């Protein structure tokens, strides 16, 4: 919805790297927990009239440093954080903003758009 859909798009993209690699059941729980985690964190930091505002704060980073939400979802689903980081694209940035979901593999990699609703 106003936030549900976008988070869903990003989650789908993220766990697609985990399936077939890690236990199916654990990946589902991981996704469910991450979803609840993102909604809670994003609340109060989602401005439809200006999606760019709070974009850095919302961005999920998974590279040399990893977003706490990924660490939490792992610990709440029985997945080892290192298995998760090992299966995801190196230096990944995932932006979840109103009307747009995108990512980038590598500090200097291209910004790819998964979802976008420019009205």
From Swiss-Prot:
Compartments where found: Cytoplasm; Nucleus
Primary location class: cytoplasm
UniProtKB keywords: Cytoplasm, Nucleus, Phosphoprotein
Tissue-wise expression: Ubiquitous.
Renumbered residue ranges of the record's region Important for nuclear localization: 84-94
Molecular function (Gene Ontology), one example: receptor tyrosine kinase binding
Motif Bipartite nuclear localization signal mapped to chain: 24-41
Family statement drawn from the similarity comment of this UniProt entry: Belongs to the BTG family.
Complex and partners: Interacts with ERBB2. Interacts with CNOT7. Interacts with CPEB3 (via C-terminal RNA-binding region); recruits CNOT7 to CPEB3 to form a ternary complex required for mRNA deadenylation and decay. Interacts with CNOT8. Interacts with CPEB4.
Protein name: Protein Tob1
Species annotation: Homo sapiens
């Amino acid at each position: 919805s106003g936030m549900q859909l976008e988070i869903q798009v990003a989650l789908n993209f993220i766990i697609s790297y985990l399936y077939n690699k890690l236990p199916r059941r654990r990946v589902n729980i991981f996704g469910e927990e991450l979803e609840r985690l993102l909604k809670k964190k994003y609340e109060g930091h989602w401005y439809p009239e200006k999606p760019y505002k709070g974009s850095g704060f919302r961005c999920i980073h998974i590279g040399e440093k990893v977003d706490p939400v990924i660490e939490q979802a792992s610990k709440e689903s029985g997945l080892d954080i290192d298995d998760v980081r090992g299966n995801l694209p190196q230096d990944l940035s995932v932006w979840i903003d109103p009307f747009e979901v995108s990512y980038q593999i590598g500090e200097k990699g291209p910004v790819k758009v998964l979802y976008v609703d420019d009205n």
